[PDB]
Each structure stands twice: as structure tokens, then as C-alpha cells.
Swiss-Prot record:
This is Solute carrier family 53 member 1. Changing R425A: Decreases phosphate efflux. The gene is XPR1. The record marks W550 as: Gating residue for phosphate transport. Pfam families: EXS, SPX. It comes from Homo sapiens. Changing Y460F: Decreases phosphate efflux. Residues 416-602 form the EXS domain.
Amino acid sequence: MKFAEHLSAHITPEWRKQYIQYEAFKDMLYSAQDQAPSVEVTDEDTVKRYFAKFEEKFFQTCEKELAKINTFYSEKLAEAQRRFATLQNELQSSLDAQKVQHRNIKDLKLAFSEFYLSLILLQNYQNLNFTGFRKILKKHDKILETSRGADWRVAHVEVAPFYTCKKINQLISETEAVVTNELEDGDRQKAMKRLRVPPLGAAQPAPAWTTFRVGLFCGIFIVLNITLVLAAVFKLETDRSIWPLIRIYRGGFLLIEFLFLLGINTYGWRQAGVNHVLIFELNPRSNLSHQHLFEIAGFLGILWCLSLLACFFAPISVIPTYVYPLALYGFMVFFLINPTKTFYYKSRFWLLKLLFRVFTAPFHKVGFADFWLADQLNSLSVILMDLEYMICFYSLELKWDESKGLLPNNSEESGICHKYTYGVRAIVQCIPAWLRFIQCLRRYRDTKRAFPHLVNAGKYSTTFFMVTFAALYSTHKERGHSDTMVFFYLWIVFYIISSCYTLIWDLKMDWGLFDKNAGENTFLREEIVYPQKAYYYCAIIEDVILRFAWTIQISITSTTLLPHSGDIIATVFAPLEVFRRFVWNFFRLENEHLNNCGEFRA
């Protein structure tokens, strides 16, 4: 409870195998103590021999661990020295050539800032390794009631190069001096702010106010949800088409669920050790933990619930009901594009910059963050459809001259908005598929490698064909023309091939599972990061079920049952799709952390 969790939390995720392995030492010590022959029943020679053998084994494995630590530290120090030499030569050449430039200076600053992080991590590694060598030896001395542990510590631990080397501190001082004198023209305070690192990993507690705000937004959200359910059961005039209301408000709920599940994903990545900071190319000093995502999700969900309640209750009769969704979505879009440096300025503007590069894909280099956001869009494709439906409902169908808005009279109300219109919903349902397809094409063009990339481009071509044939079949269905059966069967077969193509790809390369090097972990990867093995199997089963999702509905649709059956299926499968994306992110990030899965770093 003191040093086991301290080591498990302050460890560097990429260097886990290079630490002291405190837990194994503790378990071995406890097992050896518990397996003593007898206090008095057996001879004193027997127990002395047992203790001597255990002492020899403990010192042998301790020597092995110390040698491993020494070799790792020496290799890391050599790498740091080489990197410092190359970076200093680059700076010397650039400064002489100086006599655009701002971009070069900023890149040099970033390179210096990242090099300082490596030195800090190495220093932390040294400090953590000595602390564990003093604790485990102390525990050995106490458990066996001996003093040879302290003698071994004095003899070996404070002789190895991993403890007597001071070049890391000298390197840090030289780096700080170089940054202060060459990059900032004095002003050590500004240089130190850029270079200094906070406690990283799971070692940083979230501020109390952020957790309090998360709790406050969660409780208000729960109470508002209960009130919304009660109002739906009791209020509402029954004979009004509520379908536009929850079709418009479906996108907000999907966004709220996505943000909550993304916060859970961030928490899981932080705890399991799979670092999303390096994969997403974020600065390790300042990051968004799960608490910030939870707070954002809670605030936006509170706004969504308030707008829905205002729609149900209509507190003020001078304002028509349809203003509330407009106000809610205007606030949602104004929060994102807030020009002031308030309310998560850096995160929101990084997101906006990424959205600019994800919506103009072929003209930008494809990193992980922009690839990661066009894969997340595929699951939030109902949000775009909801936005288009809201725009077409307000601009074409809504009767602005009459007080009641989104809830009109039930009889014969059908308008283009709820149909494949003239094909608008089809292209708005592939837009994310188009973005991913063109991103894959750009990656293939830039790299030249067409396996990871010519493949994974037809995965979204299957979505293209799926949506196109669904649109054709539906359009032939409403007008009553013939040849619908052929289009129905083409829709069926293309959904089959699309689900099989992205299901095999999901488990083979995106997740890394089903590899010939499974070993003990049957049907799993050679090395797993998440603690329990049951998570992977349940995730595989759920992904199989949740990806083949059209099956459950078609049956419902085939029965139809006489209600608006399709709308009940897509308002009960969209959250399932978001949950599937949330569970897919975990293993995508884990595979990328373990074995560069998409080749986004070299």
C-alpha cells in the first residue's frame, strides 16, 4: 500500500520490464518465509540450510536485476548523449545560417523540450530504482532477521554506474544553459517554464474543484433525466408527432454518450499504461485527464436536458418551442469556436485544427490524431444525419408562423425530411466513410506501401456501396417501381460483406488479436496490457454482435409491427454503435502502444 502502488503508478509505461520488479521479489520472500520446514520439529541444520539456499537465490536474482538496470541505464545515457550532440550541431548550424525562421525556432524549441523530458524520465528511473533497492533489502533483513541485506546494499548498490553517474544532472544543466542563452536571449524563467515537467502518469491527482464540478454536473444530469422521464410519461399531448423532437435531440445524446465514453477510455488508457500522449502527439506536460472530459460531457448533457425539458414544458409562451433546440445547438457550436482564451481554449482549438485537417484530408499529412477522428466519425454518423434533418426541417417543413413547432399534428405528416429525399442523406451518411477512404488513399500515395493501405481503403468502399444500394432500394420502394427485390438482395449481400470486412479487420490488425504467437493467451495477443483476460473475450463477442447490428432491426423491420419501427431501431442502435466505438478505442490504442499497428511512428 506504500511502495507497490507507488512503483506501479510512477513507472514509465514503455520501460516497465526494465524496473526492479518489486512485486515478484515480495511474493518470493513471502512464499519462502511461509514454506519454512519447521521452527523446532526439524533439525537446526535443515532450517539453516534452507535459509542459506534462499539467501543465495535472493542475492543471485538481485545481482541479475542490478546488472539489467546498469545495462539499461548505460544504453539510455549513450542515447541521450548522442541525441544531445546531434541536436546541438543542428542548433549551431541553424543559428549561423540565420545571419520560416519562426517555424525553425519553434521546432528547435520543441526538440529541446522533448529532449529535456527524456533526461527527466531517466533521472526519475534512477531515483525510483534506488528507492526499491533500499525497500526490498530492508524487508529481506526484517523478514529473515539478518543484516546481510544492508551489507549487500552498501557493497553493490552504491557502486554501480546507475547510481554514481552524475552526467545526467550535468546534461540537464547544459541543456538549460543552452536553451536560456541561445533560444530565449536570457530570461531563464521563460525557458524553465517550457522545460519543467509536472508529475506525469497516474501520479498526478486531479484538482478537487474539477472532481467537485464533475460530481455536480453528474447529479444534476441524473435528476434532470428522472424529471424528463416523468414528464414524458405524464406530460405530452399524446396526439402529436414526437418523432421530430427525438430525431433532433438524438444527436446531442449521442455526443454526450461519446464524450462520457471517451473520458472512460482516457481513464482506462492512463491506468493500463497505454499512453495516448505520445500516440496522439500531445505535450506530456499539459493533458486532458478523464475528469475534464467527464466535466465537459456533464455540462453539455445538462444543457441538452434543460433544452429538452423546455421543449416539454414550454415555460414561456412568447417564445415558440423550436427555439430551444436551436439555442442548445448554437451554444454547443459557440462553445467549440469560442475565440476567447477561456473554457478549454487549447483543447478546443487543437480539436478545431484537427477537424480542419480531417475535413480536407488529401491535402494534409495523415497522422494518428486525424486518422483517429475520422474513424470515430463513422460511429457518430447519426449526428451528421440529425444535423441535416434539423436543417431541412427548419428550412423547409417547420411552420414558423404558428406557435407549436417540433410537435405538430399527427395526421398525414410526411415531408421530404424523413425520406432519402433526393440522395442528400446518402452522401451525408458516407461523408465519414469518404474522409477515411481518401485518408487511406493519401497514406498509400505518400508511403507507397499498399498492403496496410490499398486494403483498409475498400473497407469504406463497402460502406459506400452499402449506403448507395440501400438508398436505391428505398427510393424504388417509395415510388412502387419494380426491380426492388434485386436491390434488396444486393443491399443484403453488401451489408454482409461490409460487416465481415470490418469485423475481421477489427480483430486482426486494429486490435492485434488472433496471432500465431498467442502462446498461453489463447486467441489473444502475445502480450496483453489490460489486467483481466475476460475483457478481451467479452469485447470480441460484443464487437461481433454489435457490428452485425442490421440483423436485429431487419427482423423488426420485417415484422414492422405497424409503429415507426425503423426509427425505434436506429434510436436504440446508435448508442450501441457508440459503445462499440468506445470499446474499440481501448484495443486500438493498446495495439498501437504495443506494436505500431498503423505505422504512424518510425
